[PDB]
Design a protein around this motif. Structure first.
Motif, PDB file in Angstrom:
ATOM      1  N   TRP D   1     -10.716  -0.014  18.013  1.00  0.00           N
ATOM      2  CA  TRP D   1     -10.779  -1.390  18.119  1.00  0.00           C
ATOM      3  C   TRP D   1     -12.401  -1.910  18.598  1.00  0.00           C
ATOM      4  O   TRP D   1     -12.684  -1.488  19.673  1.00  0.00           O
ATOM      5  N   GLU D   2     -12.908  -2.500  17.691  1.00  0.00           N
ATOM      6  CA  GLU D   2     -14.231  -2.929  18.103  1.00  0.00           C
ATOM      7  C   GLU D   2     -14.168  -4.362  18.698  1.00  0.00           C
ATOM      8  O   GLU D   2     -13.291  -5.029  18.516  1.00  0.00           O
ATOM      9  N   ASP D   3     -15.378  -4.449  19.784  1.00  0.00           N
ATOM     10  CA  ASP D   3     -15.286  -5.869  20.332  1.00  0.00           C
ATOM     11  C   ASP D   3     -16.374  -6.795  19.302  1.00  0.00           C
ATOM     12  O   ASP D   3     -16.510  -7.857  19.876  1.00  0.00           O
ATOM     13  N   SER D   4     -16.519  -6.511  18.198  1.00  0.00           N
ATOM     14  CA  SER D   4     -17.155  -7.345  17.038  1.00  0.00           C
ATOM     15  C   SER D   4     -16.154  -7.542  16.132  1.00  0.00           C
ATOM     16  O   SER D   4     -16.373  -7.833  14.786  1.00  0.00           O
ATOM     17  N   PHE D   5     -14.829  -7.656  16.321  1.00  0.00           N
ATOM     18  CA  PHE D   5     -13.647  -7.864  15.216  1.00  0.00           C
ATOM     19  C   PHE D   5     -12.956  -9.240  15.395  1.00  0.00           C
ATOM     20  O   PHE D   5     -12.178  -9.445  14.361  1.00  0.00           O
ATOM     21  N   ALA D   6     -12.969  -9.757  16.491  1.00  0.00           N
ATOM     22  CA  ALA D   6     -12.370 -11.284  16.769  1.00  0.00           C
ATOM     23  C   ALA D   6     -13.277 -12.171  15.695  1.00  0.00           C
ATOM     24  O   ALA D   6     -12.499 -13.057  15.129  1.00  0.00           O
ATOM     25  N   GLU D   7     -14.503 -12.192  15.690  1.00  0.00           N
ATOM     26  CA  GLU D   7     -15.164 -13.168  14.917  1.00  0.00           C
ATOM     27  C   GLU D   7     -15.054 -12.415  13.520  1.00  0.00           C
ATOM     28  O   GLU D   7     -15.343 -13.429  12.616  1.00  0.00           O
ATOM     29  N   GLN D   8     -14.704 -11.300  13.377  1.00  0.00           N
ATOM     30  CA  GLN D   8     -14.424 -10.911  11.907  1.00  0.00           C
ATOM     31  C   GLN D   8     -12.898 -11.183  11.318  1.00  0.00           C
ATOM     32  O   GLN D   8     -12.708 -11.036  10.138  1.00  0.00           O
ATOM     33  N   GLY D   9     -12.350 -11.853  12.529  1.00  0.00           N
ATOM     34  CA  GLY D   9     -10.876 -12.380  12.007  1.00  0.00           C
ATOM     35  C   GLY D   9      -9.883 -11.322  12.221  1.00  0.00           C
ATOM     36  O   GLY D   9      -8.609 -11.664  12.383  1.00  0.00           O
ATOM     37  N   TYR D  10     -10.170  -9.899  12.596  1.00  0.00           N
ATOM     38  CA  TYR D  10      -9.228  -9.032  13.044  1.00  0.00           C
ATOM     39  C   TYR D  10      -8.720  -9.144  14.233  1.00  0.00           C
ATOM     40  O   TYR D  10      -9.292  -9.919  15.230  1.00  0.00           O
ATOM     41  N   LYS D  11      -7.653  -8.679  14.531  1.00  0.00           N
ATOM     42  CA  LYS D  11      -7.070  -8.615  16.143  1.00  0.00           C
ATOM     43  C   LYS D  11      -6.763  -7.228  16.634  1.00  0.00           C
ATOM     44  O   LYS D  11      -7.178  -6.201  15.895  1.00  0.00           O
ATOM     45  N   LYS D  12      -6.195  -7.298  17.600  1.00  0.00           N
ATOM     46  CA  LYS D  12      -5.985  -5.850  18.520  1.00  0.00           C
ATOM     47  C   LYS D  12      -4.488  -5.654  18.533  1.00  0.00           C
ATOM     48  O   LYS D  12      -3.754  -6.556  19.009  1.00  0.00           O
ATOM     49  N   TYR D  13      -3.959  -4.561  18.198  1.00  0.00           N
ATOM     50  CA  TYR D  13      -2.518  -4.390  18.621  1.00  0.00           C
ATOM     51  C   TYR D  13      -2.220  -3.101  19.329  1.00  0.00           C
ATOM     52  O   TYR D  13      -3.194  -2.292  19.493  1.00  0.00           O
ATOM     53  N   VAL D  14      -1.355  -3.253  20.558  1.00  0.00           N
ATOM     54  CA  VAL D  14      -1.123  -2.257  21.475  1.00  0.00           C
ATOM     55  C   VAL D  14       0.297  -1.808  21.463  1.00  0.00           C
ATOM     56  O   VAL D  14       1.100  -2.571  21.383  1.00  0.00           O
ATOM     57  N   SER D  15       0.528  -0.427  21.130  1.00  0.00           N
ATOM     58  CA  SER D  15       1.962  -0.140  20.900  1.00  0.00           C
ATOM     59  C   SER D  15       2.156   1.145  21.285  1.00  0.00           C
ATOM     60  O   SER D  15       1.401   1.458  22.393  1.00  0.00           O
ATOM     61  N   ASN D  16       3.152   1.653  21.345  1.00  0.00           N
ATOM     62  CA  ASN D  16       3.698   2.961  22.080  1.00  0.00           C
ATOM     63  C   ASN D  16       3.539   4.150  21.218  1.00  0.00           C
ATOM     64  O   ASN D  16       3.783   4.125  19.819  1.00  0.00           O
ATOM     65  N   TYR D  17       2.996   5.215  21.761  1.00  0.00           N
ATOM     66  CA  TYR D  17       3.084   6.678  21.167  1.00  0.00           C
ATOM     67  C   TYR D  17       4.404   7.204  21.392  1.00  0.00           C
ATOM     68  O   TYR D  17       4.661   8.228  20.458  1.00  0.00           O
ATOM     69  N   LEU D  18       5.099   7.390  22.802  1.00  0.00           N
ATOM     70  CA  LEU D  18       6.375   8.156  22.840  1.00  0.00           C
ATOM     71  C   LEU D  18       7.668   7.534  22.321  1.00  0.00           C
ATOM     72  O   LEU D  18       8.400   8.329  22.128  1.00  0.00           O
ATOM     73  N   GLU D  19       7.403   6.294  21.359  1.00  0.00           N
ATOM     74  CA  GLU D  19       8.547   6.099  20.576  1.00  0.00           C
ATOM     75  C   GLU D  19       7.727   5.310  19.311  1.00  0.00           C
ATOM     76  O   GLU D  19       6.718   5.289  19.193  1.00  0.00           O
ATOM     77  N   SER D  20       8.584   5.635  18.097  1.00  0.00           N
ATOM     78  CA  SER D  20       8.236   5.057  16.862  1.00  0.00           C
ATOM     79  C   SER D  20       8.473   3.550  16.893  1.00  0.00           C
ATOM     80  O   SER D  20       7.515   2.790  16.742  1.00  0.00           O
ATOM     81  N   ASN D  21       9.576   2.954  16.834  1.00  0.00           N
ATOM     82  CA  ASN D  21       9.852   1.535  16.709  1.00  0.00           C
ATOM     83  C   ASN D  21       9.885   0.863  18.203  1.00  0.00           C
ATOM     84  O   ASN D  21      10.607   0.717  18.947  1.00  0.00           O
ATOM     85  N   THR D  22       8.410   0.600  18.563  1.00  0.00           N
ATOM     86  CA  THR D  22       8.305  -0.015  19.765  1.00  0.00           C
ATOM     87  C   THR D  22       8.684  -1.389  20.090  1.00  0.00           C
ATOM     88  O   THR D  22       8.643  -1.909  21.201  1.00  0.00           O
ATOM     89  N   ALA D  23       9.368  -1.931  19.075  1.00  0.00           N
ATOM     90  CA  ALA D  23      10.002  -3.165  19.159  1.00  0.00           C
ATOM     91  C   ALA D  23      11.570  -3.157  18.948  1.00  0.00           C
ATOM     92  O   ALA D  23      12.135  -4.336  19.008  1.00  0.00           O
ATOM     93  N   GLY D  24      12.097  -2.137  18.678  1.00  0.00           N
ATOM     94  CA  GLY D  24      13.595  -1.843  18.210  1.00  0.00           C
ATOM     95  C   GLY D  24      13.809  -2.442  16.921  1.00  0.00           C
ATOM     96  O   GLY D  24      14.919  -2.531  16.316  1.00  0.00           O
ATOM     97  N   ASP D  25      12.741  -2.929  16.027  1.00  0.00           N
ATOM     98  CA  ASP D  25      12.891  -3.561  14.697  1.00  0.00           C
ATOM     99  C   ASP D  25      13.130  -2.433  13.749  1.00  0.00           C
ATOM    100  O   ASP D  25      12.933  -1.270  14.089  1.00  0.00           O
ATOM    101  N   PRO D  26      13.843  -2.591  12.629  1.00  0.00           N
ATOM    102  CA  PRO D  26      13.819  -1.726  11.615  1.00  0.00           C
ATOM    103  C   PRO D  26      12.506  -1.333  10.848  1.00  0.00           C
ATOM    104  O   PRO D  26      12.684  -0.420  10.080  1.00  0.00           O
ATOM    105  N   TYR D  27      11.656  -1.894  11.140  1.00  0.00           N
ATOM    106  CA  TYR D  27      10.052  -1.667  10.643  1.00  0.00           C
ATOM    107  C   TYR D  27       9.239  -0.899  11.739  1.00  0.00           C
ATOM    108  O   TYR D  27       9.474  -1.512  13.036  1.00  0.00           O
ATOM    109  N   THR D  28       8.710   0.232  11.350  1.00  0.00           N
ATOM    110  CA  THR D  28       8.174   0.949  12.604  1.00  0.00           C
ATOM    111  C   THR D  28       6.714   0.537  12.379  1.00  0.00           C
ATOM    112  O   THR D  28       6.335  -0.579  11.796  1.00  0.00           O
ATOM    113  N   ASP D  29       5.895   1.038  13.292  1.00  0.00           N
ATOM    114  CA  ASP D  29       4.618   0.441  13.665  1.00  0.00           C
ATOM    115  C   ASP D  29       3.576   0.476  12.815  1.00  0.00           C
ATOM    116  O   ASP D  29       2.848  -0.761  12.487  1.00  0.00           O
ATOM    117  N   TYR D  30       3.429   1.475  11.829  1.00  0.00           N
ATOM    118  CA  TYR D  30       2.409   1.612  10.632  1.00  0.00           C
ATOM    119  C   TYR D  30       3.319   0.699   9.507  1.00  0.00           C
ATOM    120  O   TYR D  30       2.144   0.019   8.788  1.00  0.00           O
TER     121      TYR D  30
END
Lengths: 77, 97, 49, 48
Positions: D1-30
């Motif tokens: 994550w660069e700090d020159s990406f919000a004006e590029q329109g991109y955002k920042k996502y923070v997730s977990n490495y110790l588990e795959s489905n960090t929200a319990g959804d049937p869709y994983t992080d990638y």
């Protein structure tokens, strides 16, 4: 020191002796400086996999990545 | 629906029931009610009791900014040019919360 | 429900009946009763025989 | 994550490495971050 006859993905010595702690998704030996760290100690069996008869095995049950509707006091095996 | 390696998706046996309660044990239920619509979202939380888990936690203002797509405008929060402040809306909690 | 290698979980054929009696042959049944709630737990035992 | 990406329109996502489905959804992080999993999902449900 990995003579686990059952392939339950854990130190068999940590099964039979004092205990262990699942931490960073790996089985570390139980330190006596972990209760104030908030971690606990689990003691399970090496001679069998499902040491409580549950459909979740020991590495599945200790490391809480098996079912999130399970209450947290049902995490120790 | 979920896509396989064949490129298309399938809907057979992929029930939504067996992901209901799991989500309802990790999340807070935040609901918004505007004058015409209503929105119910589930935002993930972090259990402070057991410390082996590493869930990136946040605060309730950041939770509202992350759940809905909320634009931080000059410190305020705006949802479809609607102001949502701590003083500009009406909040409702149940007694345990 | 149990998760496969695909990451999501499934509920089909995974009955709870065929883990009832097995648990009821290894465990002691301890029940707590407070003034509003009640809790039934199964705790594993060790056969001394 | 660069700090020159919000004006590029991109955002920042923070997730977990110790588990795959960090929200319990049937869709994983990638699957959930890279929006190539289901297009009927609303765009504010893309962060994990």
């Amino acid at each position: 020191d990995e003579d686990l006859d059952t392939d339950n993905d854990n130190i068999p010595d940590s099964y039979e002796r004092n205990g262990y702690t699942i931490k960073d998704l790996i089985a570390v030996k139980w330190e006596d400086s972990f209760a104030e760290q908030g971690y606990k100690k689990y003691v399970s069996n090496y001679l069998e996999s499902n040491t409580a008869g549950d459909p979740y095995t020991d590495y599945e049950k200790a490391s809480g990545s098996f079912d999130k509707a399970i209450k947290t006091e049902a995490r120790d095996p | 629906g979920t896509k396989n390696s064949s490129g298309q998706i399938v809907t057979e046996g992929n029930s939504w029931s067996d992901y209901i309660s799991q989500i309802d044990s990790i999340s807070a239920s935040i609901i918004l009610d505007t004058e015409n619509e209503s929105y119910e979202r589930r935002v993930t939380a972090k259990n402070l009791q057991d410390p082996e888990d590493k869930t990136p936690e946040l605060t309730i203002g950041e939770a509202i900014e992350k759940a809905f797509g909320a634009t931080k405008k000059d410190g305020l929060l705006y949802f479809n040019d609607i102001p949502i402040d701590e003083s500009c809306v009406e909040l409702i909690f149940d007694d345990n919360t």
